Amino acid sequence: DADNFCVQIIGGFFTWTPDGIPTLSNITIRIPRGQLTMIVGQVGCGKSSLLLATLGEMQKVSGAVFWNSNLPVAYASQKPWLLNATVEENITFESPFNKQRYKMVIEACSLQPDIDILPHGDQTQIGERGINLSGGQRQRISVARALYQQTNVVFLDDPFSALDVHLSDHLMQAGILELLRDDKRTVVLVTHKLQYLPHADWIIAMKDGTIQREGTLKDFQRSECQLFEHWKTL
């Protein structure tokens, strides 16, 4: 079924093949069920040390990772990515889609003015040749297109990267809100701006290679830590 929406990361030894020096070591945790947890710390591409490697696209040497008993898993790319096609064909990866989740997405993504800016809109050319697309628009159709599949697992990167306040709260209006980005479907995400963090049920931060703490914003505030840091130095 849905894999139960858990992650087993135990005694991680991350192998970066061409490097020779294991930049990250022993970042481990178990992601819980029905649990929204935003990987935080804004380490940069180190969050991608959590995407490629610590999310299992690469292989962890010592210890291991495990996801349910059965081995739908999706994530959005950092850099702008698309396939040359209709923008609708862009919002939809090779699997199908329907009008309810369609409007659920472009309306969720609030793309209506955005997808009305490009001249032909829906069937307009979208991709490499032609169709010059705004950066936040790439993170945009990349984002919904990520969550448009409506499958168990999902992952985000730099949600406000070169984005706007209207698209920040709007990124709260699509991103969590009450929307399908939230509630029963399991999710993951990594922010940049430290202010909007409060909407996160669960939080985690990164120090060097290892998790600085595992828990909520209270105990780490008690750790005078990044949660207490955005308090001290905002």
CSV table of C-alpha atoms in Angstrom, one decimal:
chain,number,residue,atom,x,y,z
A,1,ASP,CA,0.0,0.0,0.0
A,2,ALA,CA,1.3,3.4,1.1
A,3,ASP,CA,4.6,2.0,2.7
A,4,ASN,CA,3.2,3.1,6.1
A,5,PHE,CA,5.1,6.5,5.7
A,6,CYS,CA,8.2,5.8,7.9
A,7,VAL,CA,11.9,6.0,7.4
A,8,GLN,CA,14.6,3.8,9.0
A,9,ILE,CA,18.0,5.5,8.9
A,10,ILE,CA,20.3,3.7,11.3
A,11,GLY,CA,24.0,4.5,11.8
A,12,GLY,CA,24.4,6.2,8.4
A,13,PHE,CA,27.7,6.0,6.7
A,14,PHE,CA,27.4,8.1,3.5
A,15,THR,CA,29.7,7.2,0.6
A,16,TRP,CA,30.4,10.0,-1.8
A,17,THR,CA,32.2,8.1,-4.5
A,18,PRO,CA,34.4,10.6,-6.4
A,19,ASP,CA,35.1,12.7,-3.4
A,20,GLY,CA,37.1,10.2,-1.2
A,21,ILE,CA,36.2,11.9,2.1
A,22,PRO,CA,32.8,11.1,3.6
A,23,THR,CA,31.5,14.7,3.8
A,24,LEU,CA,28.4,13.5,5.8
A,25,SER,CA,28.5,10.8,8.4
A,26,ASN,CA,25.9,9.4,10.8
A,27,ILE,CA,22.8,11.5,10.1
A,28,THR,CA,20.1,9.0,11.2
A,29,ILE,CA,16.5,9.0,12.2
A,30,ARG,CA,13.1,7.3,11.8
A,31,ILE,CA,10.6,9.4,10.0
A,32,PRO,CA,7.2,8.7,11.6
A,33,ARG,CA,3.7,7.9,10.3
A,34,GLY,CA,1.3,10.5,9.2
A,35,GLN,CA,4.0,12.9,10.2
A,36,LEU,CA,4.9,16.2,8.6
A,37,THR,CA,8.6,17.0,9.3
A,38,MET,CA,10.5,19.8,7.6
A,39,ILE,CA,14.2,19.2,7.4
A,40,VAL,CA,15.7,22.5,8.4
A,41,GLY,CA,19.0,24.3,9.0
A,42,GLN,CA,19.2,25.6,5.4
A,43,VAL,CA,22.6,23.9,4.9
A,44,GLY,CA,22.2,24.4,1.1
A,45,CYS,CA,23.1,21.5,-1.1
A,46,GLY,CA,23.7,19.6,2.2
A,47,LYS,CA,19.9,19.3,2.3
A,48,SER,CA,20.6,17.4,-1.0
A,49,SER,CA,23.1,15.4,1.1
A,50,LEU,CA,19.7,14.5,2.6
A,51,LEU,CA,18.0,14.2,-0.9
A,52,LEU,CA,20.4,12.1,-3.0
A,53,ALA,CA,22.2,10.2,-0.2
A,54,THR,CA,20.2,10.4,3.1
A,55,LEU,CA,17.0,9.9,1.2
A,56,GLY,CA,18.5,6.8,-0.4
A,57,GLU,CA,19.0,7.8,-4.0
A,58,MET,CA,22.6,6.8,-3.2
A,59,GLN,CA,23.5,3.9,-1.0
A,60,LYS,CA,24.4,4.2,2.7
A,61,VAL,CA,27.3,1.9,3.6
A,62,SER,CA,27.4,1.3,7.4
A,63,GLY,CA,24.2,0.8,9.2
A,64,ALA,CA,21.4,1.0,6.7
A,65,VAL,CA,18.0,2.5,5.6
A,66,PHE,CA,14.7,0.6,5.5
A,67,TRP,CA,11.3,1.7,4.2
A,68,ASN,CA,8.3,-0.6,5.1
A,69,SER,CA,8.4,-4.1,3.8
A,70,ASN,CA,7.9,-3.3,0.1
A,71,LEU,CA,10.5,-1.5,-2.0
A,72,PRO,CA,5.4,6.2,-6.0
A,73,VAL,CA,8.4,7.7,-4.2
A,74,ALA,CA,8.8,11.2,-5.6
A,75,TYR,CA,10.7,14.5,-5.0
A,76,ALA,CA,11.1,17.8,-6.8
A,77,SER,CA,14.4,18.8,-8.3
A,78,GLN,CA,16.3,21.8,-6.9
A,79,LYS,CA,17.4,23.3,-10.2
A,80,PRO,CA,14.6,24.2,-12.6
A,81,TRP,CA,13.5,21.0,-14.5
A,82,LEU,CA,10.7,20.2,-17.0
A,83,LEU,CA,10.1,18.2,-20.2
A,84,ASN,CA,9.4,19.9,-23.5
A,85,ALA,CA,5.6,19.6,-23.8
A,86,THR,CA,2.3,21.3,-23.1
A,87,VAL,CA,2.3,23.0,-19.7
A,88,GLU,CA,-0.5,20.6,-18.9
A,89,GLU,CA,1.7,17.9,-20.1
A,90,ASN,CA,4.3,19.5,-17.8
A,91,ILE,CA,2.0,19.5,-14.8
A,92,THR,CA,1.5,15.8,-15.5
A,93,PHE,CA,4.3,13.3,-15.5
A,94,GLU,CA,3.8,10.2,-17.7
A,95,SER,CA,1.0,8.9,-15.4
A,96,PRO,CA,-2.6,10.2,-16.1
A,97,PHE,CA,-4.5,12.9,-14.3
A,98,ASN,CA,-8.1,14.2,-14.0
A,99,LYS,CA,-9.8,17.6,-13.9
A,100,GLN,CA,-10.6,17.5,-10.2
A,101,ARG,CA,-7.0,17.0,-9.2
A,102,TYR,CA,-6.0,19.2,-12.2
A,103,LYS,CA,-7.8,22.3,-10.9
A,104,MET,CA,-6.8,21.0,-7.4
A,105,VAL,CA,-3.2,21.6,-8.5
A,106,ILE,CA,-3.1,24.6,-10.8
A,107,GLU,CA,-5.7,26.2,-8.5
A,108,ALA,CA,-3.8,24.8,-5.5
A,109,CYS,CA,-0.6,26.1,-7.1
A,110,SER,CA,-2.7,29.2,-7.9
A,111,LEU,CA,-1.2,29.0,-11.4
A,112,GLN,CA,-4.4,30.5,-12.8
A,113,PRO,CA,-2.8,33.9,-13.4
A,114,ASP,CA,0.6,32.2,-13.7
A,115,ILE,CA,-0.6,29.8,-16.4
A,116,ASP,CA,-2.6,32.7,-17.9
A,117,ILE,CA,0.6,34.7,-18.4
A,118,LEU,CA,2.1,32.4,-21.0
A,119,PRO,CA,0.2,33.2,-24.2
A,120,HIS,CA,-1.6,29.9,-25.0
A,121,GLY,CA,-1.7,28.6,-21.4
A,122,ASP,CA,-2.8,25.0,-21.0
A,123,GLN,CA,-1.7,23.5,-24.4
A,124,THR,CA,1.1,26.2,-24.8
A,125,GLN,CA,4.5,24.8,-25.4
A,126,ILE,CA,6.4,24.2,-22.1
A,127,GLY,CA,9.9,22.9,-22.0
A,128,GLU,CA,13.5,23.3,-23.3
A,129,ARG,CA,13.0,24.7,-26.8
A,130,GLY,CA,10.9,27.8,-26.3
A,131,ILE,CA,8.8,28.6,-23.3
A,132,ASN,CA,11.0,30.8,-21.2
A,133,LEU,CA,9.8,30.2,-17.6
A,134,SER,CA,10.2,32.2,-14.4
A,135,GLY,CA,12.4,30.7,-11.7
A,136,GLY,CA,9.7,30.6,-9.1
A,137,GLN,CA,7.5,29.2,-11.9
A,138,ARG,CA,9.9,26.4,-12.3
A,139,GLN,CA,9.8,25.7,-8.6
A,140,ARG,CA,6.1,26.1,-9.1
A,141,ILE,CA,5.0,23.7,-11.8
A,142,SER,CA,7.9,21.5,-10.5
A,143,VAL,CA,6.3,21.6,-7.1
A,144,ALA,CA,2.7,20.8,-8.0
A,145,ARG,CA,3.9,18.4,-10.7
A,146,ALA,CA,5.8,16.8,-7.9
A,147,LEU,CA,2.6,16.5,-5.7
A,148,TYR,CA,0.2,16.1,-8.7
A,149,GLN,CA,0.9,12.4,-8.8
A,150,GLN,CA,-1.0,12.0,-5.6
A,151,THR,CA,1.2,9.2,-4.2
A,152,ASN,CA,2.4,8.4,-0.6
A,153,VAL,CA,5.9,10.0,-0.5
A,154,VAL,CA,6.8,13.6,-1.5
A,155,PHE,CA,9.8,15.8,-1.0
A,156,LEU,CA,10.5,19.6,-1.5
A,157,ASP,CA,13.5,21.8,-1.9
A,158,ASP,CA,14.1,25.6,-1.3
A,159,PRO,CA,10.4,26.4,-1.5
A,160,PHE,CA,10.7,30.2,-1.2
A,161,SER,CA,14.0,30.3,-3.3
A,162,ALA,CA,13.7,33.5,-5.2
A,163,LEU,CA,10.0,33.6,-4.3
A,164,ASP,CA,7.6,36.2,-2.9
A,165,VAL,CA,5.6,36.9,0.2
A,166,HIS,CA,2.4,36.4,-1.7
A,167,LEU,CA,3.9,33.1,-2.9
A,168,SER,CA,5.1,32.5,0.6
A,169,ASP,CA,1.8,32.5,2.4
A,170,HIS,CA,0.5,31.2,-1.0
A,171,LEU,CA,3.2,28.6,-0.6
A,172,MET,CA,1.5,28.0,2.8
A,173,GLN,CA,-1.9,28.1,1.0
A,174,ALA,CA,-0.9,25.4,-1.4
A,175,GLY,CA,2.0,23.9,0.5
A,176,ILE,CA,0.3,22.9,3.7
A,177,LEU,CA,-2.9,24.8,4.4
A,178,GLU,CA,-5.6,22.2,4.6
A,179,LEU,CA,-4.8,21.1,1.1
A,180,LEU,CA,-3.9,17.7,-0.3
A,181,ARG,CA,-0.3,18.8,0.4
A,182,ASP,CA,-1.4,18.1,4.0
A,183,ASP,CA,-3.7,15.8,6.0
A,184,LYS,CA,-3.7,12.1,5.1
A,185,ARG,CA,-1.0,12.0,2.5
A,186,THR,CA,2.6,11.8,3.9
A,187,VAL,CA,5.0,14.5,3.0
A,188,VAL,CA,8.5,16.0,3.5
A,189,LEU,CA,10.0,19.5,2.8
A,190,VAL,CA,12.9,21.8,3.5
A,191,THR,CA,12.5,25.6,3.9
A,192,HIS,CA,14.9,28.6,3.8
A,193,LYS,CA,13.2,31.5,5.5
A,194,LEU,CA,13.1,30.9,9.2
A,195,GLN,CA,9.9,32.9,9.9
A,196,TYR,CA,7.3,30.6,8.3
A,197,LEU,CA,8.7,27.6,10.2
A,198,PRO,CA,6.1,27.6,13.0
A,199,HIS,CA,3.5,26.0,10.7
A,200,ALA,CA,5.7,22.8,10.9
A,201,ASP,CA,4.5,20.1,13.1
A,202,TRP,CA,7.9,18.5,13.3
A,203,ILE,CA,11.3,20.2,12.7
A,204,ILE,CA,14.9,19.0,12.4
A,205,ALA,CA,18.2,20.8,11.7
A,206,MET,CA,21.7,19.8,10.5
A,207,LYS,CA,25.1,20.3,12.0
A,208,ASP,CA,28.1,19.2,9.9
A,209,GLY,CA,27.2,15.6,9.1
A,210,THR,CA,25.0,14.7,12.1
A,211,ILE,CA,21.6,15.8,13.3
A,212,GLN,CA,22.1,18.5,15.9
A,213,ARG,CA,18.8,17.4,17.6
A,214,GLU,CA,15.8,15.2,17.1
A,215,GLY,CA,12.4,16.5,18.4
A,216,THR,CA,10.2,19.5,18.5
A,217,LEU,CA,11.0,23.2,18.7
A,218,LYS,CA,10.7,23.2,22.5
A,219,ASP,CA,13.5,21.0,23.7
A,220,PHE,CA,15.9,22.6,21.2
A,221,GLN,CA,14.8,26.0,22.3
A,222,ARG,CA,15.9,24.6,25.6
A,223,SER,CA,19.1,23.6,23.8
A,224,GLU,CA,19.6,27.3,23.1
A,225,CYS,CA,19.8,26.0,19.6
A,226,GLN,CA,18.6,26.8,16.1
A,227,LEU,CA,15.0,26.9,17.4
A,228,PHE,CA,16.2,29.1,20.2
A,229,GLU,CA,18.5,30.8,17.7
A,230,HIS,CA,15.9,32.1,15.3
A,231,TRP,CA,14.7,33.5,18.7
A,232,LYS,CA,18.0,35.0,19.6
A,233,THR,CA,19.3,36.0,16.2
A,234,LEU,CA,16.4,36.0,13.7
